[PDB]
Design a protein around this nucleic acid. Structure first.
Lengths: 122, 122
RNA sequence: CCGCCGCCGCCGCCGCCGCG
RNA sequence: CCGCCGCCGCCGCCGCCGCG
C-alpha cells in the first residue's frame, strides 16, 4: 500500500450516477479530477465540487505541501525525479511539473492553479 | 509565413551570451520560455525577464486573448483541435491545455499562470 | 540553465475506438 | 462529461546523449 499524497478519499461517480446526473443537467460536472505523479507512480482523485465557498475550502484540503512531500519522498534517489500535478475542470487542464528538487515550488504553483481554475468565471 | 500569437519578437540568447551570463551569476536565468500550440503547429518565445515590475508588465504583453484567437483560428475546422500554452521559469513548467472551443478560458488561465509563475517568491 | 540531436521513462491535450 | 480499452497526432517533465 503506497502512501498517497491525498488527504481525502476518491469520489468517482458510478456509471449510473453519472447517467442520472447527465439526464438532469459539461460546464456543470459532478466535480473535477486531479493527480500527482512522482517518477512512474501516479495517484488520482475525482472530487465533488459545486462551485460554493464551502466546497472550495473542502477540496483545497485534499492535499498540502506536507502531504505531497511525505508521499513523494518515498521515491527520491541520488538523481532528481520528475514530479507532476495535473487538474482538469470544465474542459481546461493545468499541469505543473518539474524535478523533485523544486517540489516545494511546484506545490505553491499547483495550489494556486487549482484555486484559480476552480474559481474561473462561470 | 504563419501568423504568430506573439506580439514581441524572440529574444533567445546566443551560445556566447548564455556562457558569459553563466560565468557571472539557474534561479537567475536570462528570462523564461513560453509556447502556444494549435493542433500540430507550435510557436515559441524566449523572453528576457528580470523580476521587476516594469519587466513583468513588458512580458505580460507578449500575447493577448485577441492575438491568440487570431493566430489559432487559422487552424480551426469542423472538429475541435487541441490548444496548449506552456511556460517554464526557474525549474517549474506550467501547461494549460484543452480544445479550441474552450480557448477563451484557456487564455484566462494561461495569463494567470504566467503572472503567478513569474512572481513566485524568489 | 541558450540552441540543436537523438534515446529512456512517465505525463497532459485533441480526435477516434470499443467495453462496463 | 464516470470508469476502462486500445489507436492517432501533438505537447510537457525527469534522466541520458552528442553536436554548435
Amino acid at each position: 500500500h503506497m502512501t498517497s499524497p491525498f488527504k481525502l478519499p476518491d469520489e468517482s461517480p458510478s456509471w449510473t450516477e453519472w447517467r442520472l446526473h447527465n439526464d438532469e443537467t459539461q460546464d456543470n460536472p459532478l466535480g473535477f479530477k486531479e493527480s500527482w505523479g512522482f517518477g512512474k507512480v501516479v495517484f488520482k482523485r475525482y472530487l465533488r465540487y459545486d462551485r460554493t465557498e464551502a466546497s472550495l475550502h473542502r477540496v483545497l484540503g485534499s492535499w498540502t505541501g506536507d502531504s505531497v512531500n511525505y508521499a513523494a519522498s518515498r521515491f527520491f534517489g541520488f538523481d532528481q525525479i520528475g514530479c507532476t500535478y495535473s487538474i482538469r475542470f470544465r474542459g481546461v487542464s493545468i499541469t505543473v511539473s518539474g524535478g523533485s528538487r523544486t517540489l516545494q515550488h511546484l506545490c505553491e504553483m499547483a495550489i494556486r492553479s487549482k484555486q484559480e481554475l476552480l474559481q474561473l468565471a462561470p
